[PDB]
Design a protein around this ligand. Sequence first.
Ligand SMILES: [Cl-]
Ligand SMILES: [Hg+2]
Length: 500
Amino acid sequence: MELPRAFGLLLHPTSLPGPYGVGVLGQEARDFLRFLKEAGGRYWQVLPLGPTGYGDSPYQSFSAFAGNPYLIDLRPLAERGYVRLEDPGFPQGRVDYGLLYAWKWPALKEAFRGFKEKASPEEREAFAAFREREAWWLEDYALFMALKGAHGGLPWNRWPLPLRKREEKALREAKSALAEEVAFHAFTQWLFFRQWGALKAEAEALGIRIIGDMPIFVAEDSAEVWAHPEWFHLDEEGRPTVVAGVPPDYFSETGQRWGNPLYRWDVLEREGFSFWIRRLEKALELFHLVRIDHFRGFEAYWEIPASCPTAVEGRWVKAPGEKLFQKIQEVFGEVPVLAEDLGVITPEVEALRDRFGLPGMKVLQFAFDDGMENPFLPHNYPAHGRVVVYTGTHDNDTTLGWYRTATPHEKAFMARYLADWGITFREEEEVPWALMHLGMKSVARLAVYPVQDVLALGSEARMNYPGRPSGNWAWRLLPGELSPEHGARLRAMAEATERL
Ligand SMILES: [Cl-]
Ligand SMILES: [Hg+2]
């Protein structure tokens, strides 16, 4: 794909400032887009937007199609008198998922009662129309969530057999018996996509394109795995016989075991990869470009025996990436995908990536731990510049935090390299800005930076720490923290690098 020479910012919606414990798709989101436009930015990147479970991770959703109910702005509903909102004492600059869980779900249920009581016939018909439209995934999702409250939050593969194996009868009775709870979940979905649709229109009016994110593998306990067990490696009991992960490296002698269920690609191939065509169809309705996590998994993936706690006993299994993307290109006539090609990737992966003109990634935090041959250093970027450069991703520490823990060699080499590119700095707080400048001077078409670096915040603002048991996906901006001055700095930098 032909990307214009520009820049953008990375910011998950939950991180937006505002009342009631979590960023939502409302005024503050619109204010952020306005800020981005004022700063001359043309891209906004977010993480997966579906419903989360234990861990609060956007990469382990109960559904690959649903929207996250925690992102719904309740104020518009409160204005129509559907609900009353109170602040139980939400913390500052961070999401407390426990309080959020305890307060938002009851509020959403309350709003639905208000709706069924005061909603106008128009709204009621719009809601009904929405349900008929998204039926292909919404019926399974809503019933899925409803059945969870009927079975103590148990995963689907632990529900009674009739429900687990989706016997037509059991499902008919369930929907009828839980009809009001099922309508509740579809209601949360209706408000989500409605509010995201309005926000997307606002971005487009401001000349901003949204970069979405989707994990290559879905979660084990999700509506789509429950409704299509045939597409995954499960046993007759609905349990994964194998799970996703990566082989042992110079870092993790045990490798990584993510636990995600694996696709039966052969089965998917015969069905024209319908599941994936649907994932892309939905993504294209929410974003302008979509990045796919662990992209190498389309060429080959590490298969791990589900019984094992580690990854040491796995094996590489080839996947039909070439056929999949040929299909994607057929249906959509374009592959608006950004490949997350970090880590160990082979020439086969590169060929698949460049074959469909998919942009790769470059992370500056990883460019100074070696020599000048480091592929993350700007002078080694491909001539066509079809890549996106970041200071750091959502999985890395903020750039300031990274610098404070960096090795003397990385720090000295980074200082010399920058100087070689005409960039200079005096204090640590300026390192994030120095690196953003380096990325903007590069040949990379897009430079996207996490808001934490624009603010030059430390490790306390890290979004996700792979391995750390808690405190992830919680950071939030404070009201007014992102000032117009910050915007003017970004604008001037973009202006000096032909990215305006
Ligand atoms: Cl991630
Ligand atoms: Hg990941």
